[PDB]
Design an enzyme around this catalytic site. Structure first.
Site, mmCIF file in Angstrom:
data_model
loop_
_atom_site.group_PDB
_atom_site.id
_atom_site.type_symbol
_atom_site.label_atom_id
_atom_site.label_comp_id
_atom_site.label_asym_id
_atom_site.label_seq_id
_atom_site.Cartn_x
_atom_site.Cartn_y
_atom_site.Cartn_z
ATOM 1 N N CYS A 31 38.373 62.812 26.374
ATOM 2 C CA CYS A 31 37.382 62.214 25.468
ATOM 3 C C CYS A 31 36.341 63.229 24.969
ATOM 4 C CB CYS A 31 36.700 60.975 26.084
ATOM 5 S SG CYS A 31 35.566 61.312 27.447
ATOM 6 N N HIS A 77 32.285 58.329 29.073
ATOM 7 C CA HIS A 77 33.209 58.339 27.945
ATOM 8 C C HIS A 77 32.432 58.639 26.667
ATOM 9 C CE1 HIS A 77 37.098 57.499 26.158
ATOM 10 N NE2 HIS A 77 36.483 56.814 25.214
ATOM 11 N N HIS A 89 38.456 58.392 19.274
ATOM 12 C CA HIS A 89 38.331 58.799 20.685
ATOM 13 C C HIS A 89 39.671 59.079 21.328
ATOM 14 C CE1 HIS A 89 38.867 54.800 23.085
ATOM 15 N NE2 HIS A 89 39.484 54.701 21.919
#
Length: 115
Positions: A31, A77, A89
């Site tokens: 990520c 994240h 993402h």
């Protein structure tokens, strides 16, 4: 903003690339690696490596194209904002880079800006 749009366009270019823990591109991503790659490719230096640090660096964002969206504090994240409520993402092992509505994470989130 043009730099913001540039970071977004680099992130979008990676849609379909496989997730790999430790990946920062050009072909494999985690990520925060996607975030780092997208900035580096546009000459936007100063971005840290991991999600928890990317959430703390730069300045406050608004969720415009190219802002970093982070999830949690400490953040676990991150993604690149499309500017329309969605992000690009690298989701998790076993998924590929894709666009997701930020609300679908069903958790706390904020925005940083590095450009």
């Amino acid at each position: 903003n043009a730099s913001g749009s540039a970071i977004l366009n680099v992130a979008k270019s990676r849609i379909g690339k496989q997730y790999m823990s430790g990946g920062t591109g050009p072909d494999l991503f985690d990520c925060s690696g996607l975030v780092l790659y997208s900035h580096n490719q546009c000459g936007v230096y100063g971005v840290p490596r991991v999600a928890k640090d990317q959430a703390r660096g730069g300045k406050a964002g608004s969720g415009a194209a190219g802002d970093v969206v982070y999830f949690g504090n400490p953040a676990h994240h991150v993604g690149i904002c499309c500017g329309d409520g969605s992000m690009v993402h690298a989701p998790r092992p076993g998924k590929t880079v894709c666009i997701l509505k930020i609300a679908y994470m069903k958790e706390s989130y904020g925005y940083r800006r590095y450009y």
